[PDB]
Design an enzyme around this catalytic site. Structure first.
Site, PDB file in Angstrom:
ATOM      1  N   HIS A  18     -10.721   4.528  -5.088  1.00  0.00           N
ATOM      2  CA  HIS A  18      -9.362   4.578  -4.577  1.00  0.00           C
ATOM      3  C   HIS A  18      -8.459   5.371  -5.523  1.00  0.00           C
ATOM      4  CE1 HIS A  18      -5.530   3.087  -2.858  1.00  0.00           C
ATOM      5  NE2 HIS A  18      -6.260   2.893  -1.775  1.00  0.00           N
ATOM      6  N   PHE A  26      -0.303   5.244   3.371  1.00  0.00           N
ATOM      7  CA  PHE A  26       0.083   5.795   2.073  1.00  0.00           C
ATOM      8  C   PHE A  26       1.506   6.348   2.042  1.00  0.00           C
ATOM      9  CE2 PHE A  26      -4.607   6.259   2.129  1.00  0.00           C
ATOM     10  CZ  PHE A  26      -4.896   5.436   1.062  1.00  0.00           C
ATOM     11  N   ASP A  60      -3.348  -2.127   4.296  1.00  0.00           N
ATOM     12  CA  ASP A  60      -2.155  -2.762   4.820  1.00  0.00           C
ATOM     13  C   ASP A  60      -0.940  -1.861   4.647  1.00  0.00           C
ATOM     14  OD1 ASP A  60      -3.675  -5.295   5.148  1.00  0.00           O
ATOM     15  OD2 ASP A  60      -1.680  -6.212   5.164  1.00  0.00           O
ATOM     16  N   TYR A 115       2.897  -1.049   3.422  1.00  0.00           N
ATOM     17  CA  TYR A 115       3.756  -1.534   2.352  1.00  0.00           C
ATOM     18  C   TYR A 115       4.653  -2.646   2.883  1.00  0.00           C
ATOM     19  CZ  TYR A 115       2.287   2.831   0.132  1.00  0.00           C
ATOM     20  OH  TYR A 115       1.550   3.866  -0.395  1.00  0.00           O
TER      21      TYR A 115
END
Lengths: 216, 123
Positions: free
Chosen positions: A180, A72, A59, A61
């Site tokens: 991750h 990112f 998703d 931010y």
């Protein structure tokens, strides 16, 4: 191959009218991230024929001055998210250069498709625009990248991104996968994984110039 | 189901109310200024990648993908602490905070056997 043709091929296979009306209402009534003109920034900055590496996000931010259409990446004045901090730390330990800006638009220009699987979100409401059509669209985008490119690198961080291996022709394209880069998981596989140099090694093995992951 | 409207006073979701509780506890435990807001990094990830292997075993966490919420700012980064919440299909899985290399738990369950419950410290 152009992004426009792939987008049209997707529109032939799925109706996006209800999604359009929803997103229009959302942008008119609430604060939706990222800005409207930045929804497809990953595609604008990485034309389809320039794709060398695909890094999947989840998703965008959902806080102010953060998301701007890249996975990112955050805006130049934003505080560094922890996952991005760990990405930069692994980059320093892997390639040898330290990045000081929190945006990744130069990665995009270099050929890194920074693709979130969901492309919009309401302010402060995680997964608010989940299950409206972004998943189908991004799945089809992954399929199109796997089909119409000879050899690219998929960097799949985390289990949800690794679930997309079913959509990738693993005989053609390199798959770099690990846990991750989140601080919750970075010390269980991400640190020391050296994804950048591995991607560049595969690119050179397939006759392509490497990614300049550093600043310039 | 309506945590916002299931109490006497207005409140947010269970996640956001638990966040505020975790915040008031961490502010005192770490003498936090809270001069900057708590930004949140949300991410879904397999439980076996985000929790110690000792708690996974053959429990339902061996396969579960959890919704995670990690809070951060420059102050929390300075103290190397990351408050986190973890959920699995609207049910609370974990309350805690990363402390440097450790992982402190204020609440933790595998949906079948509660591993830790110290939420009394939050209220």
């Amino acid at each position: 191959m152009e992004w426009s043709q792939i987008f049209h091929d997707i529109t032939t296979k799925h109706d996006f009218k209800a999604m359009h009306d929803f997103l229009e209402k959302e942008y008119s009534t609430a604060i939706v991230y990222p800005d409207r003109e930045n929804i497809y920034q990953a595609f604008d900055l990485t034309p389809f024929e320039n794709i060398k590496v695909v890094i999947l996000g989840q998703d965008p931010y959902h806080g102010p001055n953060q998301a701007h259409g890249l996975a990112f990446s955050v805006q130049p004045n934003a505080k560094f998210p922890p996952s991005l901090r760990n990405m930069y730390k692994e980059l320093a330990d892997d390639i040898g250069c330290v990045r000081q800006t929190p945006h990744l638009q130069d990665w995009a220009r270099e050929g890194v498709l920074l693709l979130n699987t969901v492309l919009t979100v309401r302010q402060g409401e995680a997964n608010s625009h989940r299950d409206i059509g972004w998943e189908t669209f991004t799945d089809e985008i992954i399929k199109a990248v796997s089909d119409y490119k000879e050899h690219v690198v998929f960097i799949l961080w985390g289990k949800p991104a690794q679930q997309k291996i079913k959509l990738i022709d693993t005989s053609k394209h390199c798959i770099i996968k690990s846990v991750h880069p989140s601080p919750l998981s970075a010390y269980r596989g991400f640190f020391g994984s050296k994804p950048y140099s591995k991607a560049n090694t595969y690119l050179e093995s397939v006759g392509k110039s490497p990614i300049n992951w550093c600043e310039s | 189901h309506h945590h916002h409207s299931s109490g006497l006073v207005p409140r947010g979701s269970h996640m956001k109310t638990t966040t505020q509780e975790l915040k008031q506890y961490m502010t005192r435990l770490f003498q936090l200024s809270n001069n900057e807001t708590w930004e949140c990094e949300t991410l879904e990830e397999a439980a076996e990648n985000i929790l110690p292997k000792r708690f996974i075993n053959d429990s339902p966490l061996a396969h579960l993908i959890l919704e995670t919420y990690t809070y951060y700012n420059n102050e929390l980064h300075e103290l190397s602490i990351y408050p986190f919440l973890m959920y699995s299909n609207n049910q609370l899985i974990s309350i805690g905070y990363l402390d440097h290399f450790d992982m402190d738990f204020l609440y933790l369950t595998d949906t079948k056997n509660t591993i830790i419950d110290e939420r009394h410290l939050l209220k």
